Design brief:
heterodimer; A: little secondary structure; B: alpha/beta; Protein-Tyrosine Phosphatase, Chain A; 7 helices; about 20% strand; Tyrosine-protein phosphatase non-receptor type 3 (chain B); Epidermal growth factor receptor substrate 15 (chain A)
C-alpha cells in the first residue's frame, strides 16, 4: 500500500 | 484581536516567513487519538493510502451496519455567530468501497457531494468512478444510481444524481460537483475559479446538513476548501481569522488536512485577497 505524502 | 488586526498579522507573517514556520511546526496528527479500526486486517485495503486513516473518535459509522469506511466528521464552529459548518471528509472511493460511500450519502440523505480530484492523474487511478455516465444506471450496495444531468464549466463539472434504494423504491437526489482543475499535492490552477467555486458550494449548503467533501486521500485539497469556507464565514462577520488555528481544529478531527506548505501559503494569500476585496 502506498503513502500519500510520498 | 479583530479581523483587521488578524489580517495585518497574516500579511506581516507571510513576509516574515513565520506563518509558514509555524505551519511546519504544527502536528499532522493529533497525538493520543486512537487509530485502531482503520488498521484491522479486514479494513486495510479499504484505505486508499496507508498513511491517511480516520481517528476512531470521529470516523463515520454506517447506520445499522458495521462496515468500515475511511471517512471522518469534520465540524467547524464559529461560536460568535451561533454557527457550525458540518462536513464529512473522505477519500476517493475504491472499486470495493463505493457501496459504503453511497451508504453514507443515503444514511444521512446528503444533498451535496464535492469532489476535488480528476479520476486519473499521469496514467494512474486517483479515484474510482462511482457514478455512471448518463444515461446508464449503476448498482452499488443495493442502491441504483443514475446521473440525471451533467454540465461542464471551465473548472468543474456539475451533475445531478438520483439514488434509489432498490428494496423500498425510496429515492434521494444529490448534487455532485467535480473540481477538475486542481492537481494532487498542489494548488488550484486558478485562484479566482477556486474562490468562485467555494462561494458557490457555500450557497448550496442546507443548514444542519453535512457537505460530503473528498479528493484522492481526502486531506490536502479538502483541507484547503474547508479552510477557505471557514475564512469566508469569518470575514463576512468581521471576526478574526487565524489560519493556523483553523488547520489545527481540522486536524483534531481528520489527520493531515492541508497537506503542503504551498497549499497553506496559497490559502493564506487567498484569505488576504478576500479580506481586501470585502471593505
Amino acid at each position: 500500500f502506498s503513502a500519500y505524502v510520498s | 484581536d479583530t479581523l483587521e488586526g488578524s489580517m495585518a498579522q497574516l500579511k506581516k507573517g507571510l513576509e516574515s516567513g513565520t506563518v509558514l514556520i509555524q505551519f511546519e511546526q504544527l502536528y499532522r496528527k493529533k497525538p493520543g487519538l486512537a487509530i485502531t479500526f482503520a488498521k484491522l486486517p479486514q479494513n486495510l485495503d479499504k484505505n486508499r493510502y496507508k498513511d491517511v486513516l480516520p481517528y476512531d473518535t470521529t470516523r463515520v459509522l454506517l447506520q445499522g451496519n458495521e462496515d468500515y469506511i475511511n471517512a471522518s466528521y469534520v465540524n467547524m464552529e464559529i461560536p460568535a455567530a451561533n454557527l457550525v459548518n458540518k462536513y464529512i471528509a473522505t477519500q476517493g472511493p475504491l472499486p470495493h468501497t463505493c457501496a459504503q460511500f453511497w451508504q453514507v450519502v443515503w444514511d444521512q440523505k446528503l444533498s451535496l457531494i464535492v469532489m476535488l480530484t480528476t479520476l486519473t492523474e499521469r496514467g494512474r487511478t486517483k479515484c474510482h468512478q462511482y457514478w455512471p455516465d448518463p444515461p446508464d444506471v449503476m448498482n452499488h450496495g443495493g442502491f441504483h444510481i443514475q446521473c440525471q444531468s451533467e454540465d461542464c464549466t471551465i473548472a468543474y463539472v456539475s451533475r445531478e444524481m438520483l439514488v434509489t434504494n432498490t428494496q423500498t423504491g425510496e429515492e434521494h437526489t444529490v448534487t455532485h460537483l467535480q473540481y477538475v482543475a486542481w492537481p494532487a499535492h498542489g494548488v488550484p490552477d486558478d485562484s479566482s475559479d477556486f474562490l468562485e467555486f467555494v462561494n458557490y458550494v457555500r450557497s448550496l449548503r442546507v443548514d444542519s446538513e453535512p457537505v460530503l467533501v473528498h479528493s484522492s486521500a481526502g486531506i490536502g485539497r479538502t483541507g484547503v476548501l474547508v479552510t477557505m469556507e471557514t475564512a469566508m464565514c469569518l470575514t463576512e462577520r468581521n471576526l478574526p481569522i487565524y489560519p493556523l488555528d483553523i488547520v489545527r481544529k481540522m486536524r483534531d478531527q481528520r489527520a493531515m488536512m492541508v497537506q503542503t506548505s504551498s497549499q497553506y501559503k496559497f490559502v493564506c494569500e487567498a484569505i488576504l485577497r478576500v479580506y481586501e476585496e470585502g471593505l
